[PDB]
């Protein structure tokens, strides 16, 4: 059974929620209520704090690509990701940026550890963009 389109739909749906949260903050900056900086910090505070289905999480990177906020591997924060490869050599962050720059959003598969461990395992993530800040927002499921 497969059965996996359903899980991908749920990831897609949670990432769309994260897109909503980000647009909501951006809109407030646009109307001049908070500075752009406050808006970005409020979005990151919510994304850093949120989990779903237990330990599933969101991260944010920019278009360089450079990490903005990663909640389970925070040592990546501010690091240049161009050239970051998983163990099969995949430039996965470059592929996120190409996908959103070319299609607006979409699924990208790659190898990445589960929270709390270090062995990269098969992952399928939905990534989306918030263009006014040059952000990519993502979340994925672990195939196994
Ligand atoms: Zn509101």
Residue numbers in the entry: 38 to 181
What wording appears in the published article?
Many of the HK and MCP signal transduction proteins span the cytoplasmic membrane and detect extracytoplasmic signals/stimuli via “sensor” domains that face the periplasm. Binding of a small molecule or other stimulus to these domains initiates a response in the cytoplasmic domains, which in turn triggers the downstream regulatory processes. We have undertaken a study of the periplasmic sensor domains from A. dehalogenans 2CP-C with an eventual goal of delineating the functions of some of the signal transduction proteins (The term “signal transduction proteins” hereafter is used to refer to transmembrane sensor histidine kinases [HK] and methyl-accepting chemotaxis [MCP] proteins only) from this organism. Although sensor domains have been studied for many years, there are still many unknowns about the actual ligands that stimulate a given response and the mechanism of signal transduction. It is now apparent that both HK and MCP proteins interchangeably use the PAS-like (including tandem PAS-like) and helical bundle sensor domain tertiary folds.
Periplasmic sensor domain (residues 38–190) of chemotaxis protein, Adeh_3718 was isolated, purified, and crystallized as described in the methods section. Adeh_3718 crystallized in space group P3121 and diffracted X-rays to 2 Å resolution. The crystals consist of one protein molecule per asymmetric unit and there is no indication of oligomeric interactions in the crystal as determined by the PISA server. The PAS-like domain of Adeh_3718 consists of two N-terminal helices α1 (residues 41–68), α2 (residues 72–87), followed by two small β-strands β1 (residues 96–100) and β2 (103–106), helix α3 (residues 110–114), helix α4 (residues 128–141), β3 (residues 142–151), β4 (residues 156–167), and β5 (residues 171–180). The structure of Adeh_3718 sensor has revealed a fully occupied acetate ion moiety bound to the protein in this binding site. The acetate ion is bound stacked between two tryptophan rings of Trp96 and Trp149. Salt bridges are observed between the carboxylate group of acetate ion and side chains of Lys160 and His107. Two additional hydrogen bonds are made with the side chains of Tyr94 and Tyr147. The methyl group of the acetate is facing a hydrophobic pocket lined with the side chains of Leu129, Phe130, and Phe133. Although PAS-like domains can bind ligands nonspecifically and acetate binding by Adeh_3718 sensor may just be a crystallization artifact, one cannot rule out the possibility that Adeh_3718, which is a chemotaxis protein, could be involved in sensing environmental acetate by A. dehalogenans.
